[PDB]
Symmetry: C2
Subunit: 108 residues, 2 copies
C-alpha cells in the first residue's frame, strides 16, 4: 500500500511509516517521542485524529497542485482547519497540538 | 453539522455545499470540475482520486503541521506532498485525472 494509506502503531511506528520528524519540505514535523513510538495506539490519538480530514474534505478544503521534480511527480496540498473555540476542551486541544508540533526540536 | 474536515460530499450534499465555492484564495479549495463538484464521493472516478488522500495517521505523520492564531481564531495549518508511483501502469491516467480537477473552476462560472 502507498505511504499515504499507512497507519502507524506500536509495531510499525511513525518513523517507520513516515520518516524521521524534521523541518524539510518532504518531512513531517508532528509528534513527540511518545506519539512517534505509538502512532494510533497513543493515548491521546483520537483527540488529534478529530482534526484529520476525510478523503472528501482533503480534496474539498485544500489547495491542490501538481509538481514534477527530479525525485518524481507530487500531488501538493495546503489548507487550514479552524478549531472550535466553543468546544469545552478547546484550550487542551491547542495545548496537545502544540506539544506535538516541532516536538523533535527538543529531542535529546 | 459536522466539522468541515469530517464532511463527506455526495450528490445530496455537494462539494460547494460542504466545502464552499472553488476559487483562488486561502482555505478556499481549488479542486474539482463541475461533475465532481455536483457529485462528490458519488463521482465515477472518486476511488482513483481518493487513493491519494491520507489516512488520519498519514495526515499527521507526513504533513507540516502548524498553529496560527489570528483575529478570526485558532487555525491548524497543513502542507505536504503525496508522491505518485511512476511505476504504476495507470500513472499517466492518474496525472490526467488530477490535472483535470486542479483549478478546473477557472473554465466555468
Amino acid at each position: 500500500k502507498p505511504r499515504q494509506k499507512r497507519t502507524a502503531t506500536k509495531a510499525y511506528n511513525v518513523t517507520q511509516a513516515f520518516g524521521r520528524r524534521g523541518p524539510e519540505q518532504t518531512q513531517g514535523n508532528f509528534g513527540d517521542q511518545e506519539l512517534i513510538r505509538q502512532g494510533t495506539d497513543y493515548k491521546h490519538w483520537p483527540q488529534i485524529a478529530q482534526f484529520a480530514p476525510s478523503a472528501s474534505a482533503f480534496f474539498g478544503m485544500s489547495r491542490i497542485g501538481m509538481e514534477v521534480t527530479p525525485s518524481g511527480t507530487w500531488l501538493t496540498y495546503t489548507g487550514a482547519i479552524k478549531l472550535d473555540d466553543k468546544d469545552p476542551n478547546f484550550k487542551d486541544q491547542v495545548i496537545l497540538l502544540n506539544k506535538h508540533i516541532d516536538a523533535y526540536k527538543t529531542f535529546p
